Amino acid sequence: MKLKLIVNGCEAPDDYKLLRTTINTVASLRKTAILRFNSERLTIISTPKDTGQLWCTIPHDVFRLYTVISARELNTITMECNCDSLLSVFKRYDRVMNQGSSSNMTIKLQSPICALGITFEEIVHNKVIMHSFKVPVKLLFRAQDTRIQEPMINYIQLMMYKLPPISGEFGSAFHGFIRRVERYSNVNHIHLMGVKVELKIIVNELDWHLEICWNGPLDSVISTHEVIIRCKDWKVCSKLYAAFEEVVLAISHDESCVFHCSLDRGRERGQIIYYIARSKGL
Amino acid sequence: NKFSASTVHLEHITTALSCLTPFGSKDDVLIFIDADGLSFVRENNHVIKIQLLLSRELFMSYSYRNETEDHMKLCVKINHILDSVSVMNRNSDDIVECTLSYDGHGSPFVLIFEDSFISERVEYSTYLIGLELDRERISFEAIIKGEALHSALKDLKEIGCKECYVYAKTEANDENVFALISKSQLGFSKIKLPSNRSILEKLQVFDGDSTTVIDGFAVIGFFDFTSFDKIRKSTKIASKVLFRMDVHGVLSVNILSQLPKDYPGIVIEVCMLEKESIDEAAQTEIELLMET
Amino acid sequence: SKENLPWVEKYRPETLDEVYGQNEVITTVRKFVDEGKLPHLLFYGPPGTGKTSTIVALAREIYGKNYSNMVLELNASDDRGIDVVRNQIKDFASTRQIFSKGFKLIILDEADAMTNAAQNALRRVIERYTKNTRFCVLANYAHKLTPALLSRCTRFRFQPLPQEAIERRIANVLVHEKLKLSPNAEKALIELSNGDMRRVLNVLQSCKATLDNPDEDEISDDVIYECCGAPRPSDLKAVLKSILEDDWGTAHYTLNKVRSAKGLALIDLIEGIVKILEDYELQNEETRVHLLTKLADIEYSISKGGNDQIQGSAVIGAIKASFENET
Amino acid sequence: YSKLSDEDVLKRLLQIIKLEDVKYTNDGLEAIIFTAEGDMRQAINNLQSTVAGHGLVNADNVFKIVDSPHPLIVKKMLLASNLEDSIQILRTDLWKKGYSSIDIVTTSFRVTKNLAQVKESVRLEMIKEIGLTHMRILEGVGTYLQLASMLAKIHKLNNKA
Amino acid sequence: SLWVDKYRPKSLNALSHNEELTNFLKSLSDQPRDLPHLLLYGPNGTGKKTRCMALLESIFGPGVYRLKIDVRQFVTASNRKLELNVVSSPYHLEITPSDMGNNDRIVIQELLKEVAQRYKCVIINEANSLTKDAQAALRRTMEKYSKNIRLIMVCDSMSPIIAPIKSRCLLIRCPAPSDSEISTILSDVVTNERIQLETKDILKRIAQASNGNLRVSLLMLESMALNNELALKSSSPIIKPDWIIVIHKLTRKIVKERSVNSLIECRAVLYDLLAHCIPANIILKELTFSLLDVETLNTTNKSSIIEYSSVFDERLSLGNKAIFHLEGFIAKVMCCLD
Amino acid sequence: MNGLPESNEYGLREVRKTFRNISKQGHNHGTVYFPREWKVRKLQNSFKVQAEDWLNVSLYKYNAVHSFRNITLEFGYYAPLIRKCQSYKKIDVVDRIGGPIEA
Amino acid sequence: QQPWVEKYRPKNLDEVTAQDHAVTVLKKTLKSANLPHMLFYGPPGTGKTSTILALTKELYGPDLMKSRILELNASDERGISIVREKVKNFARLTVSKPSKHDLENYPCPPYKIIILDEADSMTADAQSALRRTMETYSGVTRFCLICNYVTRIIDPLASRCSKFRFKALDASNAIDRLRFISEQENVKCDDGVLERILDISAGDLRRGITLLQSASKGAQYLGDGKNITSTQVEELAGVVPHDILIEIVEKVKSGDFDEIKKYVNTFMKSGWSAASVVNQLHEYYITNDNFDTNFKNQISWLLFTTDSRLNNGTNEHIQLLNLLVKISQL
DNA sequence: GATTCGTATC
Numbered sequence A: 001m002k003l004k005l006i007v008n009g010c011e012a013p014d015d016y017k018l019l020r021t022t023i024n025t026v027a028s029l030r031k032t033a034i035l036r037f038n039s040e041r042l043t044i045i046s047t048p049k050d051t052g053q054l055w056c057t058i059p060h061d062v063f064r065l066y067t068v069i070s071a072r073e074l075n076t077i078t079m080e081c082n083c084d085s086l087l088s089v090f091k092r093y094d095r096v097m098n099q100g101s102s103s104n105m106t107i108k109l110q111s112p113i114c115a116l117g118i119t120f121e122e123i124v125h126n127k128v129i130m131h132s133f134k135v136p137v138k139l140l141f142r143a144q145d146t147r148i149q150e151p152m153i154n155y156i157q158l159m160m161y162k163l164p165p166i167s168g169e170f171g172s173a174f175h176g177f178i179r180r181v182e183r184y185s186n187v188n189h190i191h192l193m194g195v196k197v198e199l200k201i202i203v204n205e206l207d208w209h210l211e212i213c214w215n216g217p218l219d220s221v222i223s224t225h226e227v228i229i230r231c232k233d234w235k236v237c238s239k240l241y242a243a244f245e246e247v248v249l250a251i252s253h254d255e256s257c258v259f260h261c262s263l264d265r266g267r268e269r270g271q272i273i274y275y276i277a278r279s280k281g282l
Numbered sequence B: 001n002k003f004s005a006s007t008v009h010l011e012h013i014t015t016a017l018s019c020l021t022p023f024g025s026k027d028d029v030l031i032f033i034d035a036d037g038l039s040f041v042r043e044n045n046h047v048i049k050i051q052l053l054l055s056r057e058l059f060m061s062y063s064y065r066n067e068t069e070d071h072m073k074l075c076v077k078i079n080h081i082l083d084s085v086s087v088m089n090r091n092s093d094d095i096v097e098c099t100l101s102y103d104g105h106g107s108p109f110v111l112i113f114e115d116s117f118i119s120e121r122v123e124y125s126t127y128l129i130g131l132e133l134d135r136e137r138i139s140f141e142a143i144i145k146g147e148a149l150h151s152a153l154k155d156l157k158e159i160g161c162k163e164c165y166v167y168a169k170t171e172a173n174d175e176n177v178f179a180l181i182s183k184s185q186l187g188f189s190k191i192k193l194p195s196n197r198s199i200l201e202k203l204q205v206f207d208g209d210s211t212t213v214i215d216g217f218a219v220i221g222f223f224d225f226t227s228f229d230k231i232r233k234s235t236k237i238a239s240k241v242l243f244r245m246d247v248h249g250v251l252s253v254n255i256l257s258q259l260p261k262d263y264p265g266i267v268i269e270v271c272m273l274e275k276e277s278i279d280e281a282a283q284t285e286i287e288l289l290m291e292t
Numbered sequence C: 001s002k003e004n005l006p007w008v009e010k011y012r013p014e015t016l017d018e019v020y021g022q023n024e025v026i027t028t029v030r031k032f033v034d035e036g037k038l039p040h041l042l043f044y045g046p047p048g049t050g051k052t053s054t055i056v057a058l059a060r061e062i063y064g065k066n067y068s069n070m071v072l073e074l075n076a077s078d079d080r081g082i083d084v085v086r087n088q089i090k091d092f093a094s095t096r097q098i099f100s101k102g103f104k105l106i107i108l109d110e111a112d113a114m115t116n117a118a119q120n121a122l123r124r125v126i127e128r129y130t131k132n133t134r135f136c137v138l139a140n141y142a143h144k145l146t147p148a149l150l151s152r153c154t155r156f157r158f159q160p161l162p163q164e165a166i167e168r169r170i171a172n173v174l175v176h177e178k179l180k181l182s183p184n185a186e187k188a189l190i191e192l193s194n195g196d197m198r199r200v201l202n203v204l205q206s207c208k209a210t211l212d213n214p215d216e217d218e219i220s221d222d223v224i225y226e227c228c229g230a231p232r233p234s235d236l237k238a239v240l241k242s243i244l245e246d247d248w249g250t251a252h253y254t255l256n257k258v259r260s261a262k263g264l265a266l267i268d269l270i271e272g273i274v275k276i277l278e279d280y281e282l283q284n285e286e287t288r289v290h291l292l293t294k295l296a297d298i299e300y301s302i303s304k305g306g307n308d309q310i311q312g313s314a315v316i317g318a319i320k321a322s323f324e325n326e327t
Numbered sequence D: 001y002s003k004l005s006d007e008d009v010l011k012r013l014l015q016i017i018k019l020e021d022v023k024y025t026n027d028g029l030e031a032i033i034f035t036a037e038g039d040m041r042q043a044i045n046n047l048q049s050t051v052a053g054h055g056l057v058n059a060d061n062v063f064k065i066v067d068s069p070h071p072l073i074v075k076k077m078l079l080a081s082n083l084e085d086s087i088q089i090l091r092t093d094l095w096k097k098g099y100s101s102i103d104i105v106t107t108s109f110r111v112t113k114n115l116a117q118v119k120e121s122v123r124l125e126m127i128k129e130i131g132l133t134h135m136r137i138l139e140g141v142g143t144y145l146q147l148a149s150m151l152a153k154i155h156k157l158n159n160k161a
Numbered sequence E: 001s002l003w004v005d006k007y008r009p010k011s012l013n014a015l016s017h018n019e020e021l022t023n024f025l026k027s028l029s030d031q032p033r034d035l036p037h038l039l040l041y042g043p044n045g046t047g048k049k050t051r052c053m054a055l056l057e058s059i060f061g062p063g064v065y066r067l068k069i070d071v072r073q074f075v076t077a078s079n080r081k082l083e084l085n086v087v088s089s090p091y092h093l094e095i096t097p098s099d100m101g102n103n104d105r106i107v108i109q110e111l112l113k114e115v116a117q118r119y120k121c122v123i124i125n126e127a128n129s130l131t132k133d134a135q136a137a138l139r140r141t142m143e144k145y146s147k148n149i150r151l152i153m154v155c156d157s158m159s160p161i162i163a164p165i166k167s168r169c170l171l172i173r174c175p176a177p178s179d180s181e182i183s184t185i186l187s188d189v190v191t192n193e194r195i196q197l198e199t200k201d202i203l204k205r206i207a208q209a210s211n212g213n214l215r216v217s218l219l220m221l222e223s224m225a226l227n228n229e230l231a232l233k234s235s236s237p238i239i240k241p242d243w244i245i246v247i248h249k250l251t252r253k254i255v256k257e258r259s260v261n262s263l264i265e266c267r268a269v270l271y272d273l274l275a276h277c278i279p280a281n282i283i284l285k286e287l288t289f290s291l292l293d294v295e296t297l298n299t300t301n302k303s304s305i306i307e308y309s310s311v312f313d314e315r316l317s318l319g320n321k322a323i324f325h326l327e328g329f330i331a332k333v334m335c336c337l338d
Numbered sequence F: 001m002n003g004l005p006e007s008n009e010y011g012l013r014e015v016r017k018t019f020r021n022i023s024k025q026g027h028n029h030g031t032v033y034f035p036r037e038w039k040v041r042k043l044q045n046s047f048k049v050q051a052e053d054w055l056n057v058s059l060y061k062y063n064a065v066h067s068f069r070n071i072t073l074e075f076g077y078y079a080p081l082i083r084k085c086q087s088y089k090k091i092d093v094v095d096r097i098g099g100p101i102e103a
Numbered sequence G: 001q002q003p004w005v006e007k008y009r010p011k012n013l014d015e016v017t018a019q020d021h022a023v024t025v026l027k028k029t030l031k032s033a034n035l036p037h038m039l040f041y042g043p044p045g046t047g048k049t050s051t052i053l054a055l056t057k058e059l060y061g062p063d064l065m066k067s068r069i070l071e072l073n074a075s076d077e078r079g080i081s082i083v084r085e086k087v088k089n090f091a092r093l094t095v096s097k098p099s100k101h102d103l104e105n106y107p108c109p110p111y112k113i114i115i116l117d118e119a120d121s122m123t124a125d126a127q128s129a130l131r132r133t134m135e136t137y138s139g140v141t142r143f144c145l146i147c148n149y150v151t152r153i154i155d156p157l158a159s160r161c162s163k164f165r166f167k168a169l170d171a172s173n174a175i176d177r178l179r180f181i182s183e184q185e186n187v188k189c190d191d192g193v194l195e196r197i198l199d200i201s202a203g204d205l206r207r208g209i210t211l212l213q214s215a216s217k218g219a220q221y222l223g224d225g226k227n228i229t230s231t232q233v234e235e236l237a238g239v240v241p242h243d244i245l246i247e248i249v250e251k252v253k254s255g256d257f258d259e260i261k262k263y264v265n266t267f268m269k270s271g272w273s274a275a276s277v278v279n280q281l282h283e284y285y286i287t288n289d290n291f292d293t294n295f296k297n298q299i300s301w302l303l304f305t306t307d308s309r310l311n312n313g314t315n316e317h318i319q320l321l322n323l324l325v326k327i328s329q330l
Numbered sequence H: 001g002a003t004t005c006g007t008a009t010c
């Protein structure tokens, strides 16, 4: 039960941004989060158990040092922590470099309920100001960890859409297309449309209809695909799309929707998957 | 279609429709369509009414094929209309092109937005389908700049202001005073506008006939601040606000917010009723505090 | 497009002189209007008596053209909670008149469905802003209103429509629609109306639809009974005679034959027999009790449903057992 | 505050007549007081309606514009000796006058709650019968037959068996 | 496990206690495309559920018994979590109103809306437990979604089922077997597992002590077999449910002592029975019938007892608190017997 | 009477009349107590939990759908007896569900 | 394919049988556009839903129906809020413009219809809110209320809505429809059959059609190619055989409590419904001429009380035993 | 409102 890690944001930008995006997403989704510290990767899980699940994979090479030892299988240390305290710590550490610094963030598991000793340094202008934090966490049991599993997705009718990268010419237009439905206050369900490439956002109600359509170029990696989902999950999808260049959208006919985000670190690639159940039936 | 119009200046439409946000958040909005343009008339509890005037010159594809009637009236919701005109038309290279459409009775009010990359069609079903001051009995007339009136209204809002008062008194020495006395948790609150011509450009007090300019007498207006705050967002974009009130207790606000070179701004007309003021001794305290 | 409307919402009176039946109330409110003083009116009566039509015509007469802004009408279809009463009603009855002077009119249609807190808040608005605003309350059940609200409101009782008002309205409808009505059908229609004009209008529309060719064809009592599915008086008299005089088997046969001849319902026969037996002279006072009680539970059981033949046999047995007390 | 007496109501009413100078009759003033039932506002409203609708205030005009209080009619109906008189009163005074059956049942319950010169067992039996009738009215069966049956059962329990 | 499910006939041809009902089920399963909604009514423990499962196997093939137990969450008009268990299987759904009370309308509404979207058969055990609102939704749900769903509900004493539902279903009756058929089934069971079985008369005793209940008879047989050291005796006592013994003791106390203190003791016994989650309607039924087997009561007393039983079970059906009606029935019996 | 005020009035009036008619001087009354219905509800909740456990173990180790009605009638007493001899002569639930029924 | 009840559902107003008055009124409403608010009430399985669906089909056609009809039943929430927002908004909506095909092939009335099926399950507050909703928007929206119990509809709504009672479908009413269905489905029956079916199916065509379908399925399973007899019909309808009823009457005649109790236990062991046997006993006792007037009155009241108790979802065994004991002491 | 036990006062 000896967990210790060191994070340096300035040394490696992309994976630190991935970690910050994962923390922001799990904080925005719901309170508390599951941190599974496997010996070769760290998985951050937000399980509400209709509401979606976020399964982000963070390789061990992301952090400068990843000593993980426990009596469980493959040194699996599973912990539940409040995202708000971790989010506040990460905001402080982000402002530490924003004011100008390159100090590392040391995290140790100092003692079932434990706490992480997230301590880092900051220099104003040549002064030493030690920032010490202790976030109370609970230690999930081994069987309780086994009760949490990533939901597999069937491929019988599931169809992939390769959304354009946001760094490209069409990326800003596609981001505007995604957020075009967010400017309506009285929207709770978005009914997607894909026929076999077009992505259509349809919001049909008693006395008003909406027909947002994407006329730009799109790719499907390698038939109608309709699923109606809540608007709050679509906000999370839009937030994830902006922070990831490689974004893959999977739509299942009246079953589910999958928002796949991948960060090409090559090296093991960091991936974020947001499984979303249909709010209601077609 | 019986009516069609296309525009590229969606920010102006967005602000004009957001001027109606102080009114009912999710209620009905009634639209006239004629050759001069289209108008949005909104009323609340039969005590206050707002009205927009979007001229034809503002649009660049105004057609109005209708010939059976001089005007076409349709009643729809306002919130989804605001969200539709809330595109903000970013990415200046590719301007969003709106297209309002209506095909007579039984047809939805279509709002087509084209970005050459994103196509959005919004349809609104129509529903089944007054406060005017007489232009002969005006008690007072004032022309106030929009910024000062907006600041006064915001300060009144920030101090509660359950009730509000309007003071308008002219003097023989060409001195004019205009103040907003308010009832709130604080007690007696006043906000007197400057007598300079930069803000109080004109202030004329009449004898209830709109002709004789009488001096030394004050016009009192007792208005519920829930109705008064409806004009706060209208005065935010106003360049000059025109104030008029007759003896019948009706307050009319003429918002003059002076993009196409031919259209004469957006005309916003707000008409508001005056409280009964059963207590006759309240006005006595108003004038006593005004004299000091 | 008044020809595209149901007859109930086609002959709604537009003026006070077009409202029949409640002559006293109409004369009183007309005297109120001519004198220039109108109290806080309260209209009470059974449905279809003409309360909404009367108050709407009164408001139109008072405000000929300013009806839109001088009248605030709220009913059960709109929310009338504590917040609506606190805000909207106060704002309407707190501002001055636009240019019509007089007073502001607030109509509370079906005020019996309002909550007690709403009425408690409304009583102070009524008694506070009465200088420039008058309230009208329409209700069919007075037990659902606060006693204070009844205290501050002048109560007007809308009686069920008498015969002559029904005759006059039916004559106007016949003149408008170019229809003919037999006097026997006229008597049948008024009896089934039960002091309701809406029922009369609906039955007249159904009878006009029943005729193969509306013109040159009179509406007889047979047409009325066929359209509305009600038993004829002769059928009721025959059934009562068979129950009272004949034995059990033939009385059951007569009831079954009468019911199966036209598909009549047992509840309609029960109501007809109750109406006929009320005119009977019973000298025991126990037959009355037995009849009323047994027929009441039988009617209640029919309302909850069950075996129809068992209920008919129960009716026959109840009548026979009750009339066995007269010896 | 107790209920206003007839004398005080009469004094205030007479003050209002003297201030307004309208024609009145002593029988009419007595009828106004009787209809008011100790309510001063109701008396003023009834008097104003009578003056504005008919002018001279007599018993005829007052009883032609305003109605007798239905609690008293219900109390008279419940205290009838034989069933025929009670049935006739109920019909001709509540059913032909346009009173809802639920109103009649609630008024009967209140009257029985405030009914004197009756035995406790009789009072509770009539309360139970009124409650059963109230349940039947609430469930949907609101016909005149239910009220007639309630009166019949009340008379049966009154005269025993 | 227990012998009740050990010898449960899985197939249609394995049902050998009704014969005519088996032929009728074969007639229904000949062409499943035109199969209407079915309602099975009969005595408890007859085997109606076994017939339904055998019919489903005859239609959809073996595999209907591959039950997966799932957990479902529902929300009423207000914010509330309803943890309803669902025992679904290929082309088969199971719903029971036992766990859910007055909230039984929204759960069946959501479940049938989701399942209804060939057809999928839905089984509703204990159809009498619905509160006349789930029935109101169900009538339209089955009338409009008859193409993609079929409803087969089992029940006993179908009187509390509303008329439109009974009109929308095929009425199938499942009579309880005779004592000889129960004895034959028990003989087959004891042939499959030898139990000595000294005399054939004890099988008839078990059959007569169950009143035509297969489950109760099998439970009795297993209980005697396990208690008598894997054997059986001609003089072995008849084992009966504990609440039956308690109700019999209550009847004996009522017959012997008739007083207010005895009334309070009877109230305590009824409270214990209610706390043991035994429904009050069958408590009244068993108490009434145990009173009628008392040999010291004349015909007038028995008639008064049955009349009070009818009045008070109607009152309990139209009531809210069950203790009032049970106490009233016991007090009326005491005041009639004295 | 579905909680009508007439029901409460009639019940209280009948109780008071009954106790007034039989009232006599020198009576020695007893001590009143709160109703025990909440204890019965708690016992029913415990029985519900135990029956849910029985139905879960009966639907996990094998496939057998039994109704809660049958659990309360027969399986609450017969099945513990089966599990008793089966175990002592040699499943999880061995005691009578909700405890034994006394008197 | 489909069950015969849904397969033979009427498509036009002509296919609806025995309800001549309402069908004629709706047919004349087709040639006009002054259709009032309708209140369809009657026994179950009398064709109210079929009639309203046929009228809806004829008025607008398959295309305009989706835009001009709103249907709410007991399977969806119909609270006071639902009535105050959804129904009011739909009634306030402007009538959709018909197409050229719709205006050339269908009458296309200038109003729309809101159908509230199973209106007996609606609370009084919802109906109170519905009152002015129908009254105000009568010229742009029409209302149809379908129920089985008239008393569950409040008096103002019954006043506003036109009443259309649906007659119970007896043997003479629906014998033509049953014969047509049997001929179209190739069903062979003896003389007097389908008449016993309509007699057992008292005021219900759905039950009679289901019984005919079940009898046809049984005959097809038998494969002998023989006509269906009335005996088989009574058996699958749940009708107690006459021998059992005769034994019941004989045991009731001898007023022994023990024999009656034992026979009632044996009878309820057979799963017979108490309602059917009570109806059969009522028919036997009222029809028979061996009893006098007083006995017939008492038996009628006892059977009425037993039927009312059974309709309240009580115990069948206790009610049947009490009824038979009361008969034995008559 | 009732019972049961303990004090203060007449």
Ligand SMILES: Nc1ncnc2c1ncn2[C@@H]1O[C@H](COP(=O)(O)OP(=O)(O)OP(O)(O)=S)[C@@H](O)[C@H]1O
Pocket (backbone or CB within 6 Å): C007, C008, C009, C010, C011, C012, C013, C018, C019, C020, C021, C022, C045, C046, C047, C048, C049, C050, C051, C052, C053, C054, C139, C140, C165, C169, C197, C198, G156, G159
């Ligand atoms: N006295 C009357 N004279 C003429 N038509 C009448 C009269 N009373 C009722 N009617 C007709 O019946 C229709 C319904 O009556 P309304 O006055 O609108 O309802 P109401 O009488 O207020 O009953 P409630 O209590 O509101 S359900 C009117 O539109 C008229 O067509």
Ligand SMILES: Nc1ncnc2c1ncn2[C@@H]1O[C@H](COP(=O)(O)OP(=O)(O)OP(O)(O)=S)[C@@H](O)[C@H]1O
Pocket (backbone or CB within 6 Å): E143, E164, E167, G004, G005, G006, G008, G009, G010, G015, G016, G017, G018, G019, G043, G044, G045, G046, G047, G048, G049, G050, G051, G147, G148, G169, G177, G205, G206, G209
């Ligand atoms: N007059 C009729 N003509 C033809 N078929 C009819 C008639 N009445 C009923 N049916 C048949 O009865 C079955 C059900 O009819 P529905 O109209 O849905 O029942 P219902 O009248 O709504 O009774 P409910 O729903 O219990 S209130 C269908 O198969 C119809 O074909």
Ligand SMILES: Nc1ncnc2c1ncn2[C@@H]1O[C@H](COP(=O)(O)OP(=O)(O)O)[C@@H](O)[C@H]1O
Pocket (backbone or CB within 6 Å): E003, E004, E005, E006, E007, E008, E009, E014, E015, E016, E017, E018, E043, E044, E045, E046, E047, E048, E049, E050, E051, E154, E185, E214, E215
């Ligand atoms: N034909 C049969 N042969 C043998 N056992 C049967 C037969 N029918 C039913 N059973 C037994 O009845 C038991 C349960 O019956 P069940 O289906 O629960 O009756 P119900 O449906 O009335 O509740 C099963 O365990 C099964 O062994």
Ligand SMILES: [Mg+2]
Pocket (backbone or CB within 6 Å): C051, C052, C109, C138
């Ligand atoms: Mg009205």
Ligand SMILES: [Mg+2]
Pocket (backbone or CB within 6 Å): G048, G049, G117
């Ligand atoms: Mg129907």
